[PDB]
Design a protein around this ligand. Structure first.
Ligand SMILES: *[C@@H]1O[C@H](CO)[C@@H](O[C@@H]2O[C@H](CO)[C@@H](O[C@@H]3O[C@H](CO[C@H]4O[C@H](CO)[C@@H](O)[C@H](O)[C@@H]4O)[C@@H](O)[C@H](O[C@H]4O[C@H](CO)[C@@H](O)[C@H](O)[C@@H]4O)[C@@H]3O)[C@H](O)[C@H]2NC(C)=O)[C@H](O)[C@H]1NC(C)=O
Ligand SMILES: *[C@@H]1O[C@H](CO)[C@@H](O[C@@H]2O[C@H](CO)[C@@H](O[C@@H]3O[C@H](CO[C@H]4O[C@H](CO)[C@@H](O)[C@H](O)[C@@H]4O)[C@@H](O)[C@H](O)[C@@H]3O)[C@H](O)[C@H]2NC(C)=O)[C@H](O)[C@H]1NC(C)=O
Ligand SMILES: *[C@@H]1O[C@H](CO)[C@@H](O[C@@H]2O[C@H](CO)[C@@H](O[C@@H]3O[C@H](CO)[C@@H](O)[C@H](O)[C@@H]3O)[C@H](O)[C@H]2NC(C)=O)[C@H](O)[C@H]1NC(C)=O
Ligand SMILES: Nc1nc(=O)c2nc(CNc3ccc(C(=O)N[C@@H](CCC(=O)O)C(=O)O)cc3)cnc2[nH]1
Ligand SMILES: *[C@@H]1O[C@H](CO)[C@@H](O[C@@H]2O[C@H](CO)[C@@H](O)[C@H](O)[C@H]2NC(C)=O)[C@H](O)[C@H]1NC(C)=O
Ligand SMILES: *[C@@H]1O[C@H](CO)[C@@H](O[C@@H]2O[C@H](CO)[C@@H](O)[C@H](O)[C@H]2NC(C)=O)[C@H](O)[C@H]1NC(C)=O
Ligand SMILES: *[C@@H]1O[C@H](CO)[C@@H](O[C@@H]2O[C@H](CO)[C@@H](O)[C@H](O)[C@H]2NC(C)=O)[C@H](O)[C@H]1NC(C)=O
Ligand SMILES: *[C@@H]1O[C@H](CO)[C@@H](O[C@@H]2O[C@H](CO)[C@@H](O)[C@H](O)[C@H]2NC(C)=O)[C@H](O)[C@H]1NC(C)=O
Ligand SMILES: CCCCC/C=C/C/C=C/CCCCCCCC(=O)O
Ligand SMILES: CCCCC/C=C/C/C=C/CCCCCCCC(=O)O
Ligand SMILES: *[C@@H]1O[C@H](CO)[C@@H](O)[C@H](O)[C@H]1NC(C)=O
Ligand SMILES: *[C@@H]1O[C@H](CO)[C@@H](O)[C@H](O)[C@H]1NC(C)=O
Ligand SMILES: *[C@@H]1O[C@H](CO)[C@@H](O)[C@H](O)[C@H]1NC(C)=O
Ligand SMILES: *[C@@H]1O[C@H](CO)[C@@H](O)[C@H](O)[C@H]1NC(C)=O
Lengths: 289, 49, 357, 49
């Protein structure tokens, strides 16, 4: 029967490193992490022509309309015709020696093309990836979400197909081929829920604050610094740490909230009153308790 | 005394029935959450249903 | 890159490396992890609990762990003159990072103690902060073949301002060739120093860059990715500090964040260091105090973190007051199974002995 | 045909069985925009078209 909305004024997330310069090869992928900020999703999507997406325990439209504790993006230059080599359970060199997607958090894999005139991203000369990485053969495979152990060796650069570099203990080999047409990229996105007192929010999901003072003891929808739900609020003596802002019980259900007005509110799920019916068949009449 | 222990056991059986009833609402049964509000917030049809 | 300030010039100060005066039977002051006070426990992120007990899976020290002791000393001094620095051999030791660690700081402050430089002299003990280098690959310092050199980007954490500031930067460390510096033939250890006569003379004019200036004499800082600093309130209370790393970067924790009179550590920073940290080394400090004003410095203790299950008790205000390490013994397992510190008298079946290949 | 995705039915069953009614919506559409028609897409196609 109402809405309870409280949000803090935050800065804008910094995506400029991704939108300027040359994206790296896959084995040297760049990672960005965001917390306690807002970002314009509609603008970002209009800079790219998506060719495929695959998500796990989340959907892109929910990312557009809700908030999360943090947002991690790994990105690199990647030819779209090699898409199958990034699939889970692939047996090829991409997963073994370059990038292996982690599935411990909700995650989505996106491939896209950079339109020729639209952006300030610059093209590399070649696409590139590693074909092997071994200790003298004792192969060394990527951990999920990690970097290849051969990363330092590979930074010497690759000038021809199947050129090798060694340092005495590690050896790695590289493959290169030219970029033709518009540049193509890959993005690996993951989010977390309920690990911070503040949130990351798309700009389209923001709403004006409202008060709870005239809505006590009734069921309302709430959005408190990105944490949403339904519940009934009541003014209470303060318990728990105010600077942690949220109080939970043993089942990890929210039971309290410290407001920026200075008060503490007990929180309960929406309740329903019992009803019983007394019926007499002979007279066909009824009453209620 | 055994009889007093039996009294306390009867009371405890009554309490345990209710506690087991309430605890089952936190079982995910292999879904992404035990809360319907979270499921509606994070997924879309047909995966939602 | 970010500006790291004015490049260093001149010579480094000599250090006398003498471990037999530091790791000695007379300087052993053991302190173990006491779970009944929840020592070394990191508080969960983004929430709190009030007046309940529950189990929690995370990174925790092992119960009754002794850890590892470290002690810093004044440098050599005579009336009117300042001489060589005096240190142990911490600068050449390299430790595995594994899952991270926690540090107990200033536990013996307010007690009378030895001035390591002089086995007879005794002084009241003062708190001193540690300094760290953390990185992904290590080698030898090139001229002397002394171990402990950090290659490529290195994370440095360095206290400063007479205990009112700490730096945190990620840059390549390029050795200098001047006398006693990291690229010279007379180098013995990376030892940072401050001069309290000119640095800590007045609480309104604390030198916030003295330790950083000393570090820059050993190395030229190149291609730094970031430079942060955090302000600290000066006092003599015991403290805890902690560091971990995961997909989202390096996390730093401190008991000063919420209530320094409680020992719970709270998250206060995340650093964008995404390549896995494998090694760390303590950077020794040596205070150039004058001969008339000589001091004793509190030892600090490092305990490793492990992925474990803990039983946590929260009071009404939300602090963690006591804990149980579930895998320590059979009684601890029984308590964790019942999610309670108070169990009834009885005979119980518990988890069987683990059989792994 | 370049792609198909079905929900609770298969094209071969449509070829070999009967049904109460059959509804077809159709339009001109570039095949390289295929992902924008997927369930849970965040783009302008699902929002406004
Ligand atoms: C605590 O941590 C902060 C953050 O790292 C430090 O702040 C930086 O301090 C340095 C000085 O050490 C500042 O550097 C100077 O910036 C001037 C202006 O910079 C503009 O551009 C930068 C980059 O975008 C912006 O960050 C900044 O806000 C400005 O918009 C330059 O003009 C200075 O150059 C001159 O002096 C240097 C001295 O070494 C010479 O080498 C140059 O040739 C030149 O003569 C200089 O670069 C830096 O701007 C500060 N950053 C911020 C965000 O404030 C604190 O110093 C540190 N505090 C401590 C350790 O006590
Ligand atoms: C997220 O990013 C979006 C993309 O940057 C933001 O949208 C843009 O917002 C600006 C500011 O409101 C708009 O600019 C104005 O547009 C109007 C309308 O332009 C059209 O009509 C005029 C004639 O009336 C014509 O001259 C133009 O060519 C257009 O046909 C102009 O009248 C204004 O002068 C001004 O240019 C952008 O149009 C708008 N872009 C899009 C694609 O919508 C969005 O605001 C960001 N969101 C947040 C919350 O920051
Ligand atoms: C070394 O000695 C100093 C001085 O005695 C110690 O600092 C003081 O310690 C006491 C006891 O913890 C602090 O008392 C508390 O103060 C707070 C203030 O709000 C109050 O709420 C508590 O009820 C309690 O009275 C005192 O404030 C503190 N003084 C300072 C300047 O911090 C110090 O802890 C000792 N160090 C060691 C290692 O024993
Ligand atoms: N220089 C110096 N540093 C020290 O840390 C030191 N510590 C002691 C003894 N330290 C301690 C600390 C805590 C407890 C304790 O159990 N509480 C006992 C002894 C004696 N001399 C010293 N001398
Ligand atoms: C740092 O100094 C300590 C103390 O001298 C060294 O440990 C000793 O090493 C010698 C030589 O192998 C052994 O005989 C002693 O038993 C060790 N002492 C103890 C207390 O264990 C340590 O090796 C030095 N670390 C270096 C040089 O990296
Ligand atoms: C770093 O220096 C150490 C010595 O501090 C080197 O270890 C020596 O290795 C040689 C050649 O194998 C042996 O003959 C010596 O006996 C070793 N000395 C000691 C004290 O153990 C080590 O090889 C050097 N490391 C690198 C990476 O060059
Ligand atoms: C990381 O540090 C190492 C050690 O300083 C660098 O290694 C040298 O790199 C050059 C150029 O590739 C080689 O010619 C040398 O043989 C390397 N030395 C050793 C001991 O391997 C390495 O280049 C640095 N990596 C990055 C990414 O800058
Ligand atoms: C520090 O960063 C600079 C800038 O990227 C590096 O200088 C580049 O080095 C490469 C490899 O030698 C050259 O191809 C570029 O022309 C250099 N660029 C500029 C602007 O000088 C430098 O190598 C890095 N320093 C290290 C790793 O010690
Ligand atoms: C094109 C391969 C044809 C191989 C024909 C017969 C192979 C015998 C057994 C092969 C194992 C199956 C590998 C399948 C490769 C899938 C692509 C990938 O995992 O990335
Ligand atoms: C090409 C987009 C790259 C964006 C990089 C990082 C973005 C930060 C968060 C983004 C939310 C995920 C949107 C995924 C778009 C899938 C395509 C679609 O739903 O139709
Ligand atoms: C929300 O607040 C802003 C700032 O006061 C105001 O401009 C805007 O009109 C408000 N929106 C609504 C829908 O009331
Ligand atoms: C809520 O309770 C607190 C503490 O009892 C009280 O100070 C405060 O005024 C109450 N709030 C309102 C809106 O009455
Ligand atoms: C805290 O919990 C104890 C144990 O159940 C209970 O007796 C006590 O009343 C509680 N205290 C408060 C202040 O709610
Ligand atoms: C360091 O080792 C090298 C051999 O690798 C040797 O030539 C050199 O003299 C050594 N330096 C010292 C100071 O022992």
């Amino acid at each position: 029967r109402g809405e309870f909305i409280e949000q803090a004024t935050t800065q804008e997330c910094d995506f400029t490193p991704m939108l300027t310069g040359t994206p790296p090869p896959i084995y040297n992928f760049k990672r960005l992490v965001f917390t306690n900020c807002n970002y314009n999703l509609t603008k970002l999507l209009s800079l790219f022509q998506v060719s495929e997406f695959s998500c796990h325990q989340v959907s892109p439209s929910s990312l557009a309309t809700g908030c999360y504790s943090s947002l991690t993006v790994d990105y690199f230059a990647y030819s779209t015709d090699m898409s199958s080599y990034l699939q889970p359970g692939s047996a090829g060199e991409i997963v073994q020696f370059n990038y292996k997607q982690d599935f411990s958090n909700p995650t989505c894999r996106v491939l896209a093309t950079v339109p020729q005139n639209l952006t300030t991203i610059t093209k590399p000369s070649n696409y590139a990836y590693l074909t092997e990485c071994y200790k003298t053969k004792n192969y060394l495979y990527n951990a999920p979400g990690g970097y290849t152990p051969c990363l330092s060796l590979a930074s010497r650069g690759f000038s021809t197909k199947y050129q090798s570099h060694s340092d005495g203990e590690l050896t790695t080999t590289g493959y290169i081929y030219p970029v033709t047409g518009n540049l193509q990229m890959a993005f690996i996105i993951s989010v977390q829920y309920g690990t911070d007192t503040n949130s990351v929010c798309p700009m389209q999901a923001l709403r004006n604050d409202t008060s709870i003072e005239d809505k006590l003891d009734v069921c309302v929808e709430y959005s408190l610094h990105g944490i949403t739900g339904r519940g009934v609020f009541h003014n209470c003596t303060s318990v728990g740490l105010r600077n942690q802002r949220f109080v939970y019980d043993t089942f990890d259900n929210l039971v309290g909230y410290h407001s920026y007005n200075g008060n503490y509110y007990c929180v309960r799920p929406c309740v329903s009153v019992p009803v019983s019916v007394i019926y007499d068949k002979v007279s066909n009449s009824h009453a209620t308790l | 005394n055994l009889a007093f222990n039996k009294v306390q056991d009867a009371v405890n059986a009554n309490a345990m029935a209710l506690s087991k009833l309430a605890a089952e609402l936190s079982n995910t049964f292999g879904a992404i959450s035990s809360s319907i509000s979270d499921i509606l917030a994070r997924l879309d049809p047909p995966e939602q249903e | 890159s970010v500006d790291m300030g004015t490049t260093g010039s001149g010579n480094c100060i000599e250090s006398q490396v003498q471990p037999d005066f530091f790791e000695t039977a007379r300087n052993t002051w053991p302190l173990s992890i006491d779970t009944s006070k929840a020592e070394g426990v990191i508080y969960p992120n983004g929430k709190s609990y009030s007046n309940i007990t529950l189990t929690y899976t995370g990174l925790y020290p092992k119960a009754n762990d002794l850890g590892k002791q470290y002690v810093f000393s004044d440098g050599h001094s005579s009336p009117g003159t300042l001489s060589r620095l005096f240190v142990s051999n911490y600068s050449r030791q390299v430790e595995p990072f594994d899952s991270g660690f926690v540090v107990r700081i200033g536990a013996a402050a307010n007690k009378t103690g030895t001035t390591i430089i002089s086995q007879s002299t005794n002084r009241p003990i003062k708190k001193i902060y540690p300094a760290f280098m953390l990185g992904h690959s290590v080698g030898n310092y090139t001229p002397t073949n002394i171990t402990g050199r950090y290659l490529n980007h290195t994370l440095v954490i360095l206290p400063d301002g007479c205990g009112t500031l700490v730096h945190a930067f990620y840059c390549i460390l390029q050795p200098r060739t001047q006398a006693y510096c990291a690229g010279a033939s007379t180098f013995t250890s990376v030892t940072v120093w401050d001069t309290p006569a000119s640095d800590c003379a007045n609480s309104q004019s604390y030198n916030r860059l003295a330790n950083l200036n000393a570090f820059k004499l050993y190395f030229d800082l190149i291609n730094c990715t970031f430079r942060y600093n955090y302000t600290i309130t000066e006092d003599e209370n015991a403290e805890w500090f902690g560091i971990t790393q995961d997909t989202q970067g390096v996390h730093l924790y401190s008991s000063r964040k919420e209530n320094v009179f409680r020992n719970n550590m709270f998250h206060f920073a995340t650093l964008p260091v995404y390549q896995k940290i494998l090694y760390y080394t303590v950077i020794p400090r040596s205070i150039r105090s004058p001969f008339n004003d000589r001091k004793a410095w509190a030892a600090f203790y490092i305990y490793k973190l492990h992925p474990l299950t803990y039983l946590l008790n929260f009071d009404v205000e939300g602090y963690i007051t006591k804990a149980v390490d579930c895998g320590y013994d059979d009684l601890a397992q029984l308590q964790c199974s019942y999610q309670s510190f108070d169990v009834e008298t009885g005979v119980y079946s518990v988890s069987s002995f683990e059989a792994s290949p």
